[PDB]
Amino acid sequence: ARGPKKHLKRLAAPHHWLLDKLSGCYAPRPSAGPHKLRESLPLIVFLRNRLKYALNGREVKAILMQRHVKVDGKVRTDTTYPAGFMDVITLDATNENFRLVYDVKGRFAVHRITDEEASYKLGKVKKVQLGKKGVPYVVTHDGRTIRYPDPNIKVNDTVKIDLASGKITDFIKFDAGKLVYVTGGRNLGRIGTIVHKERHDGGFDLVHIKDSLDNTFVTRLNNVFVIGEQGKPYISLPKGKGIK
Amino acid sequence: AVTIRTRKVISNPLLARKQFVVDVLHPNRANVSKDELREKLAEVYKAEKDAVSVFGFRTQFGGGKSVGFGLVYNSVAEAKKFEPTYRLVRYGLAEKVEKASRQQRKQKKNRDKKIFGTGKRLAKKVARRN
């Protein structure tokens, strides 16, 4: 092509969305945003094909511009806004709060949470660097730049972010024995505990994870997301607790 | 006798309405008009007829039963606000807008883009020229 594409064929859309192949010819193309295209759920899909509150695109537009939907504690009006993993969606009129977490099948599951849980989210530390004026900052998996991080917070760690103000309440190191969640690959959506981080210079690191059933599997480090210490997750987990 | 049955009822305060599936049992009868069904749903839900919408009704093979989808808005103004234009026209809540065929509108749009500005000066110019 000669420039960015603006259309997405239904057969080319991510499989986990569950879009009927015969319903139409095109699927919602996620706009630019915090999460990548393939790992995101546009709000139209969530409101129409998952919650069934809206019957087609147009009532979804109506709902959004009514400002009844809040993502990340902020009102969003773009139908194709790319909501993604660990994003908090609030519908105050219905008094409903959702956290986007994959099921064991690998599909974003409608997981209802309390307001107290909705007050905070988790972000994997993708980068830690000194910015201008010598101010350290951390970039999380959702593109949030948080300045003046705790200097122990390192790459691959996870930080608890307050939605209202966007500061780091607490953090978890990436160590053996911590509780992790798989965000990619065939093991997607599984929950377990670390056993070893196998390290390859100049190559992709590999992590061995043991589930509650004692089964062990290996996944690339990029697909691992720490969510707590064993037996004490910092977020409510979906039904099944990431087993199988 | 005709039986009207509502199932899978979901309250949608985002659209301020009631969404549900309508099952119509009509023994010894071809089918029930959308108007009459709107009357009965309005009476059942204690809401204005204007706030009740029904569509997508299919008679099951062999007759005697129909299944479709039904909406009951909290009040009439919200229905006018949220209904599609065509359904309002079906219910008469809105008047059909009269427009030319797509080809005529497009041809007029072409003729309009050809002319630059108001065109009155062009008219007076051609008048003086001839």
């Binding site: 309390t114 | 509502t6 979901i10 059942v44």
Partner: peptide, 16 residues
């Protein structure tokens, strides 16, 4: 922490 607990009924009329 525990997830939030889970939470209109059919109505019938006969005429004619």
């Amino acid at each position: 922490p525990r997830a939030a607990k889970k939470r209109a009924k059919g109505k019938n009329l006969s005429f004619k």
